[PDB]
A paper describes a structure:
As the first reported host of “non-pathogenic-derived” pili, [name] is a gut-adapted commensal lactic acid bacterium (LAB) and one of many clinically investigated probiotic strains for human use in the prevention and treatment of certain gastric ailments. As with other Gram-positive bacteria, sortase-dependent piliation in [name] GG (called SpaCBA) is assembled from the ~30 kDa [name] (backbone), ~20 kDa SpaB (basal), and ~90 kDa SpaC (tip-located) pilins. Two immunoglobulin (Ig)-like subdomains comprise GG-[name], each having the conserved residues of a canonical E-box motif and internal isopeptide bonds formed between either lysine and asparagine or lysine and aspartate residues. Our findings show that the GG-[name] structure has certain features in common with other pathogen-derived pilin-proteins, such as the Ig-like CnaB-type folds and the presence of internal isopeptide bonds6940.
Although the E139A mutant had been isolated using the same purification protocol used for WT protein, these conditions resulted in protein degradation when [name]-substituted GG-[name] was purified. This was remedied by modifying the purification buffer. Here, this allowed for the recovery of intact and pure [name] mutant protein in both a monomeric (E2) and trimeric (E1) form, as evidenced by size-exclusion chromatographic analysis. Crystals of full-length [name]-substituted GG-[name] had formed after three months for the E1 and E2 protein samples (for details), each having the same space groups and similar unit-cell edges as determined for the WT form. Moreover, the overall topological similarity of the [name] crystal structure to that of WT GG-[name], and including the molecular arrangement in the asymmetric unit, is high (RMSD of 0.4 Å). Surprisingly, electron density for an intact isopeptide bond is found between Lys184 and Asp295, despite the absence of the glutamate residue at position 269. Intriguingly, the alanine substitution of the C-terminal E-box glutamate ([name]) that presumably catalyzes K-D isopeptide bond formation had shown two contrasting structural effects. Here, this E-box mutation initially produced a crystal structure of the truncated N-domain lacking the K-N isopeptide bond (see further below), but then afterward, with the overall fold being retained where an intact K-D isopeptide bond was still visible in the C-domain. Up till now, this latter bonding behavior had never been observed, as in all known pilin structures, either a glutamate or an aspartate found in the vicinity of an isopeptide bond is directly associated with the bond-making process. Surprisingly, the mutation of E269 in the C-domain had no influence on K-N or K-D isopeptide formation.
Residue numbers in the entry: 38 to 302
């Protein structure tokens, strides 16, 4: 019959800050750390795996049934009621053991290590068992471009670009689950939207487009050492296609110029 509520809360910290551990009976607000939404966990029931030989259990969830799955909400939380008792491989009732496995980290963050515990666990005053897995922020990189009229030097809205890598593959943004998303004008905040960068054929690539300040680009690049190329695909009427622009994700902004098309007598 009986279950305990396990409340998992996922907080992000500055890269050089390492949270102190919290007991399961303590409610911790995160002290200003940012809650991480959209992070997927699978909870495995490893009762049988552990009780086959407790002193040898090193975290295997091979063949373990899935007790639950979830995704952190806006508060960084997922809550799951778990049976405090479960059966081992021979059918005998035992204290249940559950292993928490992060299957999909937030963009810009490392995954957290697998952890496990026995129930019932020490609970807070409200009866819930609180866990706070650590996800360390990894440094990522961004790039901004400003489209301008080569003659007037004024910013130019509505210019379309695709991005290519050294293999001739082009950038496609997806959501956390790998599905298509609708990208508009401007700088795309990959980190804030929890998007992914993928590399595909030119025809399926994402088009980035200069906004009303001429701006386009994105964050969430893995490194600042690889060369990519911005290639004009949509040219505003009355301009000549900008030349390809080689770049690195180096957190800079730089201008891409469009020459007004010349009309001769």
């Amino acid at each position: 019959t009986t279950t305990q509520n396990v409340v998992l809360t996922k907080y992000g910290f500055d890269k050089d800050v390492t949270a102190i551990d919290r007991a399961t009976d303590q409610i911790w607000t995160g002290d200003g750390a940012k809650p991480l939404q959209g992070v997927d966990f699978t909870i495995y029931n490893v009762t049988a795996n552990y009780w086959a030989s407790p002193k040898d259990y090193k975290g295997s969830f091979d063949s373990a049934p899935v007790a639950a799955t979830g995704t952190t909400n806006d508060k960084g939380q997922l809550t799951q009621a778990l049976p405090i008792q479960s059966k081992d491989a021979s059918g005998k009732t035992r204290a249940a053991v559950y292993l928490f496995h992060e299957t999909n980290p937030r963009a810009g963050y490392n995954t957290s290590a697998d952890f496990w515990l026995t129930l019932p666990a020490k609970a807070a005053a409200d009866g819930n068992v609180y866990v706070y897995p650590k996800n360390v922020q990894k440094t990522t990189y961004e790039r901004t471009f400003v489209k301008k009229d080569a003659e007037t030097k004024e910013v130019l809205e509505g210019a379309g670009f695709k991005i290519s890598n050294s293999d001739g593959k082009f950038l496609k943004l997806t959501d956390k689950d790998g599905q298509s998303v609708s990208i508009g004008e401007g700088f795309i905040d990959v980190l804030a939207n929890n998007y992914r960068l993928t590399w595909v054929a030119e025809s399926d690539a994402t088009v980035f487009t200069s906004d009303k300040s001429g701006k386009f680009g994105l964050n969430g690049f893995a490194d600042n050492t690889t060369t990519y190329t911005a290639v004009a695909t949509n040219v505003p009427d009355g301009y000549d296609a900008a030349a390809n622009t080689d770049f690195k994700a180096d957190n800079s902004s730089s201008d891409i110029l469009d020459a007004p098309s010349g009309i001769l007598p």
